[PDB]
């Protein structure tokens, strides 16, 4: 767990498109908080809105940025190599290829972007056991997803 | 994780002393919430106060009840067989024999009896994956203990 938040601003610093066509060895959950995002894949084009958590399993093409009509795309991301049991709570409904999708119900959403947010901090924390809490919260989050669906 | 809360009331229903002189195969964290408790062991006698979380490792003699001058001793308890890594966050300062001891600082206490409480509910919940959240929260709790000391 190394996690963080990326503030894409139109015409700003990191306003480039991340483009990892052959993926990574680790899972990446992506949660839009501000602006719209545009996850692209083989000619297709989804479009995230805030409150959306997308799953990018090992090997998935990573290609997304700010959707051309959006003024930005702030989003927290968490990169991780999953715990043993975790595997089961990682079969998520795709949109195209095996890029997972979530989008809580009005009531569940705040706590999810809130529980997700808690992960980022933990993981980016100058602390002793803080790497584990991130892992632990990353755990709690997924569990939460189940009890939801 | 099977957990619960036990409301000892003077002269009431369960106002008897639990007496397992040869312990159990599982760990038991004990958190006083109301009244005073009296953990006894080989002629000795500690005395818990609310906010106290005590550890009872496998094999520990379990013998405690309502301290004779207290009107009750409400306390949540959580019985569990620890996860692999967990082992490390379970060396706790004793009082007598290897009965662990905690007692947060004013600020940490509420969230701990609050995070502990969350475990009880989860575990006693009529739910799908709720047994795991209890386990997950039991995890978070211990981690919390570390970042504290």
From Swiss-Prot, chains A, B:
GO terms for cellular component: cytosol; protein-DNA complex. The gene is araC. The chain holds residues 19 to 167 of 292 of the full protein. This is Arabinose operon regulatory protein. The keyword Repeat does not apply. Induction: Negatively autoregulated. Autoregulation is either greatly reduced or nonexistent immediately after the addition of L-arabinose. Transcription is stimulated by CRP in the presence of cAMP. It comes from Escherichia coli (strain K12). GO terms for molecular function: DNA-binding transcription repressor activity; identical protein binding; transcription cis-regulatory region binding. Arabinose converts the repressor form of AraC to the activator form to regulate the araBAD promoter. In the absence of arabinose, AraC binds to the araO2 and araI1 half-sites in the promoter region of the araBAD operon, leading to the formation of a DNA loop that blocks access of RNA polymerase to the promoter. In the presence of arabinose and the cyclic AMP receptor protein (CRP), it binds to the adjacent half-sites araI1 and araI2, leading to the binding of RNA polymerase to the promoter region and transcription of the araBAD operon. Homodimer. GO terms for biological process: arabinose catabolic process.
